[PDB]
Design a protein around this ligand. Structure first.
Ligand SMILES: Nc1ncnc2c1ncn2[C@@H]1O[C@H](COP(=O)(O)OP(=O)(O)OP(=O)(O)O)[C@@H](O)[C@H]1O
Ligand SMILES: Nc1ncnc2c1ncn2[C@@H]1O[C@H](COP(=O)(O)OP(=O)(O)OP(=O)(O)O)[C@@H](O)[C@H]1O
Ligand SMILES: [Mg+2]
Ligand SMILES: [Mg+2]
Ligand SMILES: [Zn+2]
Ligand SMILES: [Zn+2]
Ligand SMILES: [Zn+2]
Lengths: 322, 322
């Protein structure tokens, strides 16, 4: 009843995608899967450019590729259309606009809203992306429970733009209060609003692309174990709240073993995994469910990232397959 | 040359310990190991009381124990001297002191130092711990790269107490500025400083216990793979910076396989693990290195947490052991 191909081949072939996120519990393969998929995209689309971004403060993209990446787009050895970059947590208009915001917000209740650094980090990031003309950006995220980088900016944008309105109108005398508090002219304050409003508008427009299922999708990564399914349920619910598309899950570390497998370790673990794979098949029956097998070695270097990518688009046949 | 028992038995038997942290890369077994060890402590010391705290916003202690825990100490089924609690991120003196701090700090450069919520979260936590009289608190931390909860408060304490000094002395007219800015009397400001200074002093005294190797130790958890050793090196360096003791690592998911093991998956993976275990044996030759074997099933429920704890103090004999 509506066979979903157990692969990311449809995502790979959907060239409208501008933003692709991979996420899930600690240790499930976010870095391995995002890195492998970004190689697959780059090698199948050599006439386009791609950016892999780590937003996990525990950056592991360098060690996955066995190549030193930095805080600026770095070209991947052997895949010259692929760039990788570490994004850290949180010009001089920043200082001025921030002070204007923090002062003006304290004129109303709950007026200490966070993520003004976030906004400026993100404005910088759009700088790079338009300049270098990437067709798609791939995110290697931090584990679930760690706040999703950039995904709440639409609510930040809204509070800033309403403050801009209040100041322009002198709503309840906020402008007078700010001028008298900061010793700025009406023209100084209007100058800060006017010069930065286009920057905010860009943030508004790209944040909307996160919520457009043609431009953005979020791929879940999990292991077939109680705690990882729990974290996956909570990631899927949080993405619904944020109006962001998630229709694909990669189940990683899948054992190629059954009741007839000699190894008693692989045999019993495969029994455990079977319960949780069936639970995922049931719960997410409209998703692409990709079975990424346990490999004989860690997934480091392009040869390994390439082999890992093959099972993202060519569904692996397990001894226990139908 | 200085045989370290490959177990946590010395830590288990060291009753001076008040604070024990478990940490490491995403997915390596922080929750499993902290939960198991906290059961072991509670069952070996039934006449004392123990608190297990999750500071991973992705709280998994409930699912590890298969018991619902909340935001207040919850008594563990079958282990009545053991309590478990989820600690979330960030009375009315809070609001007032915070406003006093944020105002007074802007009178000097870099005067926007973070973690005033942190401090108040922590003051609350010491409340519970002294009241309920726990001999030891065990922390299930967030992954490496995620900021270590409560461990930077000594530097927060210092900036607050110097502001207190400045205000008391009217250093460079900061007191006048604050009185005129906030419309408080000298006596109002002195009242806020005097009433909360004892609260700060408590934070100062307990933060110091984190840095006393008789009262506090940090146990590393890793898997024998490149990325996990990298994250472990970076956790160990960060704990040196913070003057916090780390002399124990648990290597988890260790395969009981060698060249003679029939299973080609377990045989090759054991070859990979062997390289990284030898690297850990070399690099951390003054540490307790505990080998926690891969188990046939996920570690959920007290029976499993108990079995897992046995290999924390009784070193497992592997087919490949000396
Ligand atoms: N299918 C697989 N078979 C074998 N090893 C794998 C597989 N997938 C990932 N690995 C290895 O497992 C480890 C964990 O993977 P990875 O670091 O990609 O996870 P993560 O979700 O990014 O972790 P973190 O939460 O720490 O960011 C790595 O050492 C990686 O090489
Ligand atoms: N030795 C082991 N053998 C088999 N399964 C294990 C072992 N240790 C842990 N597990 C299982 O592996 C999974 C990951 O462990 P756990 O959740 O404790 O790691 P963590 O470091 O707390 O992860 P996170 O970074 O998400 O907080 C769990 O499903 C747990 O039951
Ligand atoms: Mg990662
Ligand atoms: Mg955990
Ligand atoms: Zn195709
Ligand atoms: Zn003993
Ligand atoms: Zn096996």
């Amino acid at each position: 009843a509506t066979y979903m191909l157990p692969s990311l081949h449809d995502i790979l072939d959907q060239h409208t995608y501008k933003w692709i996120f991979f996420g899930g519990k600690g240790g499930v393969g976010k870095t391995t899967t995002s890195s492998s998929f970004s190689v697959l995209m780059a090698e199948t689309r050599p006439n386009e450019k791609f950016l892999l971004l780590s937003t996990n403060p525990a950056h592991n993209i360098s060690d996955a590729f066995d190549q030193k990446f930095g805080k600026a787009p770095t070209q991947v050895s052997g895949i010259p259309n692929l760039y990788a970059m570490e994004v850290d947590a949180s010009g001089d208009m920043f200082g001025g606009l921030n002070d204007l915001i923090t002062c003006a917000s304290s004129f109303i209740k709950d007026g200490t809203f966070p993520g003004m650094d976030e906004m400026w980090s993100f404005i910088n990031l759009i700088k790079l992306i338009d300049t270098n003309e990437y067709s798609t950006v791939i995110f290697d995220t931090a584990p679930t429970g760690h706040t999703l980088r950039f995904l709440e900016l639409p609510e930040t944008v809204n509070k800033v733009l309403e403050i801009f309105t209040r100041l322009k109108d002198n709503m309840g005398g906020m402008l007078s209060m700010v001028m008298q508090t900061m010793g700025l002219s009406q023209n100084d304050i209007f100058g800060l609003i006017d010069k930065t409003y286009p920057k905010i508008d860009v943030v508004k427009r790209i944040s909307a692309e996160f919520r457009d299922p043609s431009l953005c999708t979020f791929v879940g990564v999990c292991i077939p174990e109680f705690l990882s399914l729990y974290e996956t349920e909570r990631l899927v619910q949080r993405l619904a709240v944020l109006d962001m598309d998630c229709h694909a899950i990669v189940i990683n570390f899948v054992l190629d073993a059954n009741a007839a497998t000699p190894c008693s370790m692989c045999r019993s673990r495969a029994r455990m995994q079977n319960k949780y794979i069936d639970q995922i098949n049931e719960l997410y029956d409209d998703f692409n469910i990709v079975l990424s097998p346990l490999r004989h070695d860690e997934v480091r270097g392009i040869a390994n990232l390439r082999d890992y990518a093959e099972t993202l688009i060519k569904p692996y046949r397990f001894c226990w397959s139908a």
